[PDB]
Amino acid sequence: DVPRDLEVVAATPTSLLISWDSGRGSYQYYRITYGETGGNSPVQEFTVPGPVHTATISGLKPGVDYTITVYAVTDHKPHADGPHTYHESPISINYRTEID
Amino acid sequence: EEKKVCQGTSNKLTQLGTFEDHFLSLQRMFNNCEVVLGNLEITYVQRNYDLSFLKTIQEVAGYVLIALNTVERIPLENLQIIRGNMYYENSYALAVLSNYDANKTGLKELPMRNLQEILHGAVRFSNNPALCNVESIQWRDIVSSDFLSNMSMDFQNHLGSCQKCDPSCPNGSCWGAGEENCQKLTKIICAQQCSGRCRGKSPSDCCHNQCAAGCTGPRESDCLVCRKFRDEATCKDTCPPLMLYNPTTYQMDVNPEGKYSFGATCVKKCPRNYVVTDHGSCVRACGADSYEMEEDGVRKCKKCEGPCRKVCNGIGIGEFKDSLSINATNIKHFKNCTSISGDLHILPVAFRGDSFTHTPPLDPQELDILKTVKEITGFLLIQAWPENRTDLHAFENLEIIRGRTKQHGQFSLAVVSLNITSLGLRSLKEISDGDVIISGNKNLCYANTINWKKLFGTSGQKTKIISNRGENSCKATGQVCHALCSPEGCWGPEPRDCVSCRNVSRGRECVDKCNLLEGEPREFVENSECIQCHPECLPQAMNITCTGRGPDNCIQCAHYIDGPHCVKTCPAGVMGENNTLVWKYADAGHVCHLCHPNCTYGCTGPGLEGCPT
Ligand SMILES: *[C@@H]1O[C@H](CO[C@@H]2O[C@@H](C)[C@@H](O)[C@@H](O)[C@@H]2O)[C@@H](O[C@@H]2O[C@H](CO)[C@@H](O[C@@H]3O[C@H](CO[C@H]4O[C@H](CO)[C@@H](O)[C@H](O)[C@@H]4O)[C@@H](O)[C@H](O[C@H]4O[C@H](CO)[C@@H](O)[C@H](O)[C@@H]4O)[C@@H]3O)[C@H](O)[C@H]2NC(C)=O)[C@H](O)[C@H]1NC(C)=O
Ligand SMILES: *[C@@H]1O[C@H](CO[C@@H]2O[C@@H](C)[C@@H](O)[C@@H](O)[C@@H]2O)[C@@H](O[C@@H]2O[C@H](CO)[C@@H](O[C@@H]3O[C@H](CO[C@H]4O[C@H](CO)[C@@H](O)[C@H](O)[C@@H]4O)[C@@H](O)[C@H](O[C@H]4O[C@H](CO)[C@@H](O)[C@H](O)[C@@H]4O)[C@@H]3O)[C@H](O)[C@H]2NC(C)=O)[C@H](O)[C@H]1NC(C)=O
Ligand SMILES: *[C@@H]1O[C@H](CO)[C@@H](O[C@@H]2O[C@H](CO)[C@@H](O[C@@H]3O[C@H](CO)[C@@H](O)[C@H](O)[C@@H]3O)[C@H](O)[C@H]2NC(C)=O)[C@H](O)[C@H]1NC(C)=O
Ligand SMILES: *[C@@H]1O[C@H](CO)[C@@H](O[C@@H]2O[C@H](CO)[C@@H](O)[C@H](O)[C@H]2NC(C)=O)[C@H](O)[C@H]1NC(C)=O
Ligand SMILES: *[C@@H]1O[C@H](CO)[C@@H](O)[C@H](O)[C@H]1NC(C)=O
Numbered sequence A: 001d002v003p004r005d006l007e008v009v010a011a012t013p014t015s016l017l018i019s020w021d022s023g024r025g026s027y028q029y030y031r032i033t034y035g036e037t038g039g040n041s042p043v044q045e046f047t048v049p050g051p052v053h054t055a056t057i058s059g060l061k062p063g064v065d066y067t068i069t070v071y072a073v074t075d076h077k078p079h080a081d082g083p084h085t086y087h088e089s090p091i092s093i094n095y096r097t098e099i100d
Numbered sequence B: 001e002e003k004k005v006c007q008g009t010s011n012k013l014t015q016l017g018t019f020e021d022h023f024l025s026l027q028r029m030f031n032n033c034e035v036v037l038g039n040l041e042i043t044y045v046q047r048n049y050d051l052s053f054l055k056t057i058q059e060v061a062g063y064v065l066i067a068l069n070t071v072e073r074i075p076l077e078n079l080q081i082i083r084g085n086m087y088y089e090n091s092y093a094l095a096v097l098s099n100y101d102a103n104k105t106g107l108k109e110l111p112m113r114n115l116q117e118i119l120h121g122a123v124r125f126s127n128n129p130a131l132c133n134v135e136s137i138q139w140r141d142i143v144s145s146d147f148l149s150n151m152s153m154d155f156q157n158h159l160g161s162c163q164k165c166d167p168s169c170p171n172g173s174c175w176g177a178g179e180e181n182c183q184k185l186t187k188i189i190c191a192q193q194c195s196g197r198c199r200g201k202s203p204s205d206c207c208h209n210q211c212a213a214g215c216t217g218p219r220e221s222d223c224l225v226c227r228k229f230r231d232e233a234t235c236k237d238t239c240p241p242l243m244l245y246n247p248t249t250y251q252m253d254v255n256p257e258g259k260y261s262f263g264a265t266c267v268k269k270c271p272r273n274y275v276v277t278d279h280g281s282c283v284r285a286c287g288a289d290s291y292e293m294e295e296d297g298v299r300k301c302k303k304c305e306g307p308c309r310k311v312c313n314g315i316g317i318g319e320f321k322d323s324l325s326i327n328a329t330n331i332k333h334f335k336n337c338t339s340i341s342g343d344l345h346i347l348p349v350a351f352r353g354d355s356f357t358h359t360p361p362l363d364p365q366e367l368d369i370l371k372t373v374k375e376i377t378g379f380l381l382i383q384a385w386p387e388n389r390t391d392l393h394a395f396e397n398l399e400i401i402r403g404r405t406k407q408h409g410q411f412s413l414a415v416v417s418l419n420i421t422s423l424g425l426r427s428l429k430e431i432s433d434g435d436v437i438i439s440g441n442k443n444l445c446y447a448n449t450i451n452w453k454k455l456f457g458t459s460g461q462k463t464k465i466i467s468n469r470g471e472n473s474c475k476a477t478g479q480v481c482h483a484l485c486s487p488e489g490c491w492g493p494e495p496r497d498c499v500s501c502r503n504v505s506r507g508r509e510c511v512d513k514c515n516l517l518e519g520e521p522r523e524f525v526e527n528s529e530c531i532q533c534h535p536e537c538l539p540q541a542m543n544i545t546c547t548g549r550g551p552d553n554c555i556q557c558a559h560y561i562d563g564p565h566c567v568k569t570c571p572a573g574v575m576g577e578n579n580t581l582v583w584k585y586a587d588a589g590h591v592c593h594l595c596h597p598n599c600t601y602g603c604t605g606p607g608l609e610g611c612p613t
């Protein structure tokens, strides 16, 4: 049910502290993807637990334009043999890393 | 030793109920399990939940996924091997991800002090801020070299409240605090001489090829874990064959000591509720390209004839409720469907598209999806067809129309106002109920030749075939039935388009003769059908090549003779009676003869002579 306010809250030439609001919604987890807006090489990804709304993206290249996407993910069933509920609600921002 | 088994799970990152339900079902599945046939997935386990039941696990056939857990400890203390018969995210046999909370606490200890082997796949470690000791681990001893390139290892904390490894650990590699948690090495520390594993650096200290993880001695009965199969107290490359070669009859007989493979175990009988496969394995359920059949009281997997039977809904019933036609959106759902439960409508609105329902035009290439349809329960109504297609091509495999439901409550087959030249319905064998309307097909030429009373199930079923191409102009422009067709009519001009042939047939085609004496692939005749001879039958001049199917029905062999069979090569390495291999050699007359009994690996000629030595 739509996450919002994806934002870089703190940064160094090679790291970003990203933050978002889950809102009136509950997700099992978040899929974070990042890559140079360019970008030739594919996006890097990691998963953040549903209850956490903050993330550290490390090992970035300074002076590069990055696209950061957060997919809030619904992935449940009421039982092992139950109907699967699977949905992804994405939010994204563009951020340029600072010179060293 | 025989171990306690369990299925494992395939929920990946899916949550089942609340955190409690999810735990309860995790516990129900893995409680007292020693060998996991599937995957070990430990997800969403909250702080303070007890995972002590995991200590019993010692083998995982598929992959191990440990994600989104909040527990400080996952006591997989006795897990020896992950076979990686299945991967997580296309490459990982082990994936430990995001096991933390808002405070940056979570999984601290994963004391896998007995994990010595990962047969297939790589290892991914991502975003576990609380994890200790695992960064010291030398995965080169654990993982197969082919996968070291595919590893994904990310480790980080603060100091993360971690205890250092014991001084006794090699290169400081450990799984946790204490000397019992040191990494035991059995690959990287081996002598150059060693084939696989070892219980020390010395040449004496070397494991049998059939061992996995490690060993206690150098025999295939002294392995910690079996690299492939465990037959009672020994590791074997395969199970005793189900069939054996009888040198006397040259026939494959049922092996009295034959064993089915259940996981990485050799069994005389499959366990209750398990199905026998085409390769000797015990399986919970048959594959996608196969159906199950309780032949001789034993449930078995048989590769299904063509595409596997998929009964799915018609226009207006299931997903297709409120849909006026097979269209750009819905056509996807008809994928490998063989039977239609209800009606099929192909109307102009499909090809033109519809604004009101947000349906774009149908791409005529998409109609090829319907080639799997062999049965229509209801009726078939075609009011539109791509003008450039001369045939009802998509319906070439349609065998039966049932007419349970009918168009305007009358027709089971309605083919109206199309550019078609022929009804390409070569498989149409029965119209169980309903009437047949074929009108306004300006170029349609063959409908009138068919004996519809043959196809019709009941009398009372009638045809309304009018306003098509002039029956005289059809004749006039040669648009008639092939001379090989029986008077029973045709679906088009081709000899494959006949209802029945006047003589013989090869496949779907009516032919003037079978390749008995002259043809490219030589043939025999069965029920007025040209059946090929086995490729091992040597073609004959002025005489028949074969008397039936198989290499036991050749007049003369093309390559080698093994008693009654024609073979491309002599039997070599096939298992015979009393656990002794059958090896044959070929003589000057191309005849297969048994090798000297001392030729345990095979021979080139008779006696010890054609045997090195
Ligand atoms: C996790 O697994 C533990 C191991 O259990 C085995 O594995 C699971 C997956 C099942 O297949 C189970 O059947 C296996 O035994 C499990 O512990 C076990 O719990 C069961 C009951 O759930 C115990 O059996 C039953 O209790 C008694 C047994 O008597 C003695 O048990 C132990 C000694 O071993 C001591 O506590 C005492 O000396 C007891 O005197 C039987 O009376 C009972 O029989 C039947 O009772 C009535 C009869 O009408 C009916 O309800 C059923 O027909 C019962 O079958 C059971 O046999 C079993 O002893 C115990 N295992 C061991 C080795 O102790 C544990 O409970 C699991 N965890 C959870 C949360 O369930
Ligand atoms: C199964 O059935 C096939 C079809 O059966 C024929 O057609 C039906 C309607 C009946 O009339 C039936 O009695 C027929 O046999 C059958 O194929 C047929 O086999 C014969 C004999 O091999 C073929 O005849 C020979 O070929 C030509 C024929 O000239 C034309 O015939 C028709 C005309 O519409 C067309 O096929 C072509 O335009 C041909 O050009 C002759 O040149 C030939 O010469 C003989 O001449 C004299 C005899 O007077 C002698 O010197 C020799 O006997 C010569 O052989 C033959 O008459 C016939 O063409 C062929 N039809 C087709 C369409 O294939 C097939 O043999 C049967 N198979 C089995 C397994 O039984
Ligand atoms: C083309 O095929 C699609 C099916 O993939 C048809 O779409 C379906 O159309 C019906 C209406 O024609 C939709 O049903 C409506 O649903 C609401 C509730 O969601 C209900 O209150 C209405 O009374 C009505 O039943 C249906 O949702 C819709 N969507 C899908 C994806 O199935 C489409 O109509 C077809 N068009 C033609 C011209 O054949
Ligand atoms: C539909 O088609 C076939 C059965 O006719 C199945 O999938 C095929 O086989 C394997 C999967 O085991 C893959 O190569 C492809 O998915 C399919 N190949 C081809 C050539 O079609 C399966 O039952 C169905 N697959 C899909 C995607 O609908
Ligand atoms: C329609 O009719 C005939 C059928 O023989 C043929 O010209 C072609 O298949 C079609 N032509 C066009 C222009 O669609």
Ligand SMILES: *[C@@H]1O[C@H](CO)[C@@H](O)[C@H](O)[C@H]1NC(C)=O
Pocket: B364, B386, B388, B389
């Ligand atoms: C028939 O359909 C279209 C007509 O536009 C086109 O692709 C081609 O002319 C034909 N052949 C095939 C294979 O579709």
